[PDB]
Design an enzyme around this catalytic site. Structure first.
Site, PDB file in Angstrom:
ATOM      1  N   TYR A  27     -44.292  32.400 -57.280  1.00 43.66           N
ATOM      2  CA  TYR A  27     -43.733  31.814 -58.494  1.00 43.66           C
ATOM      3  C   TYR A  27     -42.614  32.577 -59.181  1.00 43.66           C
ATOM      4  O   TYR A  27     -41.951  32.038 -60.056  1.00 43.66           O
ATOM      5  CB  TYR A  27     -44.842  31.563 -59.513  1.00 43.66           C
ATOM      6  N   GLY A  29     -39.184  33.496 -59.802  1.00 44.78           N
ATOM      7  CA  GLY A  29     -37.831  33.125 -59.420  1.00 44.78           C
ATOM      8  C   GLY A  29     -37.549  31.704 -58.973  1.00 44.78           C
ATOM      9  O   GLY A  29     -36.434  31.213 -59.152  1.00 44.78           O
ATOM     10  N   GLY A  31     -40.727  29.474 -58.218  1.00 45.40           N
ATOM     11  CA  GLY A  31     -41.977  28.772 -58.445  1.00 45.40           C
ATOM     12  C   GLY A  31     -42.126  27.519 -57.602  1.00 45.40           C
ATOM     13  O   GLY A  31     -41.308  27.247 -56.720  1.00 45.40           O
ATOM     14  N   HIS A  47     -45.631  32.041 -66.810  1.00 43.22           N
ATOM     15  CA  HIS A  47     -44.279  31.912 -67.349  1.00 43.22           C
ATOM     16  C   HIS A  47     -43.643  30.570 -66.979  1.00 43.22           C
ATOM     17  O   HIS A  47     -42.986  29.955 -67.815  1.00 43.22           O
ATOM     18  CB  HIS A  47     -43.397  33.080 -66.877  1.00 43.22           C
ATOM     19  N   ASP A  48     -43.834  30.111 -65.742  1.00 41.58           N
ATOM     20  CA  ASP A  48     -43.270  28.824 -65.344  1.00 41.58           C
ATOM     21  C   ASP A  48     -43.936  27.758 -66.213  1.00 41.58           C
ATOM     22  O   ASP A  48     -43.278  26.846 -66.722  1.00 41.58           O
ATOM     23  CB  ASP A  48     -43.548  28.519 -63.861  1.00 41.58           C
ATOM     24  N   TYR A  51     -42.547  27.630 -69.802  1.00 36.91           N
ATOM     25  CA  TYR A  51     -41.308  26.859 -69.791  1.00 36.91           C
ATOM     26  C   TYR A  51     -41.666  25.386 -69.669  1.00 36.91           C
ATOM     27  O   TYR A  51     -41.005  24.523 -70.241  1.00 36.91           O
ATOM     28  CB  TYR A  51     -40.431  27.278 -68.605  1.00 36.91           C
ATOM     29  N   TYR A  64     -31.122  33.346 -77.048  1.00 38.73           N
ATOM     30  CA  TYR A  64     -31.882  33.658 -78.247  1.00 38.73           C
ATOM     31  C   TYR A  64     -31.629  35.112 -78.623  1.00 38.73           C
ATOM     32  O   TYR A  64     -31.064  35.880 -77.839  1.00 38.73           O
ATOM     33  CB  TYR A  64     -33.377  33.412 -78.021  1.00 38.73           C
ATOM     34  N   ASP A  89     -40.698  34.351 -72.681  1.00 35.99           N
ATOM     35  CA  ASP A  89     -40.132  35.494 -71.972  1.00 35.99           C
ATOM     36  C   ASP A  89     -40.788  36.811 -72.402  1.00 35.99           C
ATOM     37  O   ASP A  89     -41.018  37.713 -71.582  1.00 35.99           O
ATOM     38  CB  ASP A  89     -38.622  35.549 -72.211  1.00 35.99           C
TER      39      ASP A  89
END
Ligand SMILES: O=C(O)Cc1ccccc1Nc1c(Cl)cccc1Cl
Length: 121
Positions: A27, A29, A31, A47-48, A51, A64, A89
């Site tokens: 996952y 980079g 996923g 993290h995926d 998002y 951000y 993140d």
């Protein structure tokens, strides 16, 4: 944006997003599929997913602003997407930092076919 995430990564782990985490496990980079190979991979899976909770946002390109109070990551107020992107993140960075002890190079450039099965967020 991808630009902030990598810098966040580097400061946190001392490693470079590319190529240390750009193609790790199933996952990190890109996923997609399979069972996360390890803790670091698990960080990416989550993290995926994070998002994933933001269909109407643009994580890769929306920038951000964040500061470190001492060692802590603090997301500065911006657009709602921007704030929720940052929190995603920040989580991944801390996570990476928390599993650096098991980071494994044998998972770098992991081949796709070795990632079987869907896993729900
Ligand atoms: O979750 C991760 O490890 C990060 C991740 C997920 C999806 C897409 C890209 C990245 N990372 C990534 C970064 Cl962080 C910088 C330059 C190029 C790429 Cl492909």
């Amino acid at each position: 944006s991808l630009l902030e995430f990598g810098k966040m990564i580097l400061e946190e782990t001392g490693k470079l997003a590319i190529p240390s985490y750009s193609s790790y496990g199933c996952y990190c980079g890109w996923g997609g599929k399979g069972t996360p190979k390890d803790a670091t991979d698990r960080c990416c899976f989550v993290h995926d997913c994070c998002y994933g909770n933001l269909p109407d946002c643009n994580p890769k390109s929306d920038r951000y602003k964040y500061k470190r109070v001492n060692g802590a990551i603090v997301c500065e107020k911006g657009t709602s997407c921007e704030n929720r992107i940052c929190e995603c993140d920040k989580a991944a960075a801390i996570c990476f930092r928390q599993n650096l002890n098991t980071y494994s190079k044998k998972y770098m450039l992991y081949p796709d076919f070795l990632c079987k099965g869907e896993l729900k967020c």
